[PDB]
Amino acid sequence: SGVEGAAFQSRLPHDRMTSQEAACFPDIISGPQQTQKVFLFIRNRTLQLWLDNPKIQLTFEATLQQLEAPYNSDTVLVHRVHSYLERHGLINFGIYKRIKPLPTKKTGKVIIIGSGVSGLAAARQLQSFGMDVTLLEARDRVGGRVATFRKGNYVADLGAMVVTGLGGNPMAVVSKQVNMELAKIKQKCPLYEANGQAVPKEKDEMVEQEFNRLLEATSYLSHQLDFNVLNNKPVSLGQALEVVIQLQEKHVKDEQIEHWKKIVKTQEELKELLNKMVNLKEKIKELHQQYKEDITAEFLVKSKHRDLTALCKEYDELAETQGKLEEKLQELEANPPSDVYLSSRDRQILDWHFANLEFANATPLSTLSLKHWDQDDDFEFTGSHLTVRNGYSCVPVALAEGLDIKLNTAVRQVRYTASGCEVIAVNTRSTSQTFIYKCDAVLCTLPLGVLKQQPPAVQFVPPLPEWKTSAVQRMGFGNLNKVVLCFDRVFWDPSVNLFGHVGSTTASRGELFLFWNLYKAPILLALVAGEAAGIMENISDDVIVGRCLAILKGIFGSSAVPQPKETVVSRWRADPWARGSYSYVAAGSSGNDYDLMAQPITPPIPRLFFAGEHTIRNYPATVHGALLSGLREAGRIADQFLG
Ligand SMILES: Cc1cc2c(cc1C)N1[C@H](O)C[C@H](c3c(F)c(F)c(F)c(F)c3F)[C@]13C(=O)NC(=O)N=C3N2C[C@H](O)[C@H](O)[C@H](O)COP(=O)(O)OP(=O)(O)OC[C@H]1O[C@@H](n2cnc3c(N)ncnc32)[C@H](O)[C@@H]1O
Numbered sequence: 001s002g003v004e005g006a007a008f009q010s011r012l013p014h015d016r017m018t019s020q021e022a023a024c025f026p027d028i029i030s031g032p033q034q035t036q037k038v039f040l041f042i043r044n045r046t047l048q049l050w051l052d053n054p055k056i057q058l059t060f061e062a063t064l065q066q067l068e069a070p071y072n073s074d075t076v077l078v079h080r081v082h083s084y085l086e087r088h089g090l091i092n093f094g095i096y097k098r099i100k101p102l103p104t105k106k107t108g109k110v111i112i113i114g115s116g117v118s119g120l121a122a123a124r125q126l127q128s129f130g131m132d133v134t135l136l137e138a139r140d141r142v143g144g145r146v147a148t149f150r151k152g153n154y155v156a157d158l159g160a161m162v163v164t165g166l167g168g169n170p171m172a173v174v175s176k177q178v179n180m181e182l183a184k185i186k187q188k189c190p191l192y193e194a195n196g197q198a199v200p201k202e203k204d205e206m207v208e209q210e211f212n213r214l215l216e217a218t219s220y221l222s223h224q225l226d227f228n229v230l231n232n233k234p235v236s237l238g239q240a241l242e243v244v245i246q247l248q249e250k251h252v253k254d255e256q257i258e259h260w261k262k263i264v265k266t267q268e269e270l271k272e273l274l275n276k277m278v279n280l281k282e283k284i285k286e287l288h289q290q291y292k293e294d295i296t297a298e299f300l301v302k303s304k305h306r307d308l309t310a311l312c313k314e315y316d317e318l319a320e321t322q323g324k325l326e327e328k329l330q331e332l333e334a335n336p337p338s339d340v341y342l343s344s345r346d347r348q349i350l351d352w353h354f355a356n357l358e359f360a361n362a363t364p365l366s367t368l369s370l371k372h373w374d375q376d377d378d379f380e381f382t383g384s385h386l387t388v389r390n391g392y393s394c395v396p397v398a399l400a401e402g403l404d405i406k407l408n409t410a411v412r413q414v415r416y417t418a419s420g421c422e423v424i425a426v427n428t429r430s431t432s433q434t435f436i437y438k439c440d441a442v443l444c445t446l447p448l449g450v451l452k453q454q455p456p457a458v459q460f461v462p463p464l465p466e467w468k469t470s471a472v473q474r475m476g477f478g479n480l481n482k483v484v485l486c487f488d489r490v491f492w493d494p495s496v497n498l499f500g501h502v503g504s505t506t507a508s509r510g511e512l513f514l515f516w517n518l519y520k521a522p523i524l525l526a527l528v529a530g531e532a533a534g535i536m537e538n539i540s541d542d543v544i545v546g547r548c549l550a551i552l553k554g555i556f557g558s559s560a561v562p563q564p565k566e567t568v569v570s571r572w573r574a575d576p577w578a579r580g581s582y583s584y585v586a587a588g589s590s591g592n593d594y595d596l597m598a599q600p601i602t603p604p605i606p607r608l609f610f611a612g613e614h615t616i617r618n619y620p621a622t623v624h625g626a627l628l629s630g631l632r633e634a635g636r637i638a639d640q641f642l643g
Helices: 002-009 019-024 033-051 060-064 075-087 117-128 171-178 201-223 237-285 297-308 312-332 344-360 375-379 394-399 448-452 466-474 530-538 541-555 623-641
Strands: 109-113 132-136 148-151 154-157 182-184 386-388 409-416 421-427 434-439 441-444 459-461 481-486 498-501 514-516 523-528 566-569 608-610
Touching (some): 002 033, 033 060, 033 075, 109 434, 117 623, 132 409, 154 481, 154 523, 171 394, 237 312, 409 441, 421 441, 441 623, 448 466, 481 530, 481 541, 523 541, 541 566
Parallel strands (some): 409 459
Antiparallel strands (some): 148 154, 421 434, 481 566, 514 523
């Protein structure tokens, strides 16, 4: 599966054209299948070549000279394919040598708002497409939601930090380009309760098993019984979970009842049995006496005998059918069903798994769309998740190489007319001096959090379409902060990549719930998800770092946890250039909104385009998702202006 592998790594089916490829190649799709059979191969072969060496640019003639007979003969077809793959970022993207110099004459002027991974991606494309591009960044750096703390030998990511499986992941290519040092995450994750004592492997799995069961349940109700709407309002994942758990609690009490009923019943049957026994116990005194009292005694005590014995053939007899009761009685009162669904402690551990989810989605479960929260699930990449051992910032930096980025430039208004665009921005360091950049098209990679901001951070003239603003408002933009604790000593298990901390209450189940051991230097990361994420931003670094040490000193014991010589704390929600961590499908929305976002705004011809982790439906809230959305718009614009 050589050429079959390339197709896969590019999120493409090696044995069939996609709806898009069919749109650009109608002649092929609607023609001899033998031809379509050829198209694919060339496509899969071109990709193969590019992936087997993403360091250097794969030119048209470079591809045409590496194909074999008879493919290399159909030059025209090869070109159409090669060109296509290049125009849509499937080849020659990221950072690579340009064996063919860029045209001295840049055709088309486009302004890109934001120097994030999505912005830098599209930027390098449009530029390589021989087009004058300019990026306006508000921050004094690049990467946007990709930040990395670097001081001495210390390295830590305050933003992105994980690479979700290399299989099919575009970052796999970029990684190979920027020499990004990655490392798998050892699944071994020990949980420590409030006091500080670990959780026995038994429960750790007992609870986690239920966690999966409850989720599966919610999935059932949602995608099988269609329980996505209640009281005319959308149902949230958390909402559903609370209900499912509310049922398990019921069932538990139900069995507890039937059991108490069996008990009471057996007890009733006993008290009753003992009663007549005492009546027969008395019926014996009537015969064990009165005897030896009739000259025909030879037949008197003779008959009476089988009468007193017959009554004993009952008493000690009932003891038999009475024995089969003490057994059942003691047997039941010794095998009582689960007193409760989850103990006060069981719930605490389960909250860790929910908090762990509130971390993944970067928002409280009660705000997630029970039906669409996991809409992009069918697009995950195969392979183990990785961590950027050397700071995830090494990527956006390499991408900004050779680009015209103007840091310290906050865009405050975007003007798009039937012909031409104007992007008015101001210098952050000196809000007095403003700037006015003219262009043909504008690419807005602004975070959903900024677009939602009220009052608006940037002004759109004419005002953004109604179908757009509404989508922006319906979508959800989560939050998630970290606390980088820099030490000069590793007092924790060096083998364990991450360990968790269980909270005391459901409310604060996301407060420093997970610690990370990823970087070389003695550094740990504390995550604050869910409710805590936003709240914790109102607490000074001092107190925050304080609470952390406490947690640590409770796990590793005090006197073993030294004072951090360097500490970093994020507040993406407070960050004026972010206003949150990343998007998420909120109850009352869907992946459909992730397309309305991508939809360009047009007055007779598309002028304003959008990109970002909130515009790519199948790969939302991710570095690669943002990357792909970048390459996406890159081509979209290229067609609109270069054709
Ligand atoms: C916020 C955040 C986001 C992420 C994150 C952590 C945080 C705190 N890390 C976490 O480690 C776990 C997720 C994680 C996960 F999410 C998952 F889904 C998952 F499955 C996991 F397993 C994870 F581990 C993860 C990760 O580990 N792995 C991931 O793949 N993604 C992660 N994310 C999300 C990504 O950071 C995010 O998708 C990406 O950064 C998006 O990039 P972008 O689209 O270019 O957006 P941008 O903000 O970078 O760029 C906008 C630019 O515009 C500028 N700007 C602003 N305002 C103005 C003006 N007014 N004028 C001019 N300019 C301007 C801004 O300043 C920028 O320069």
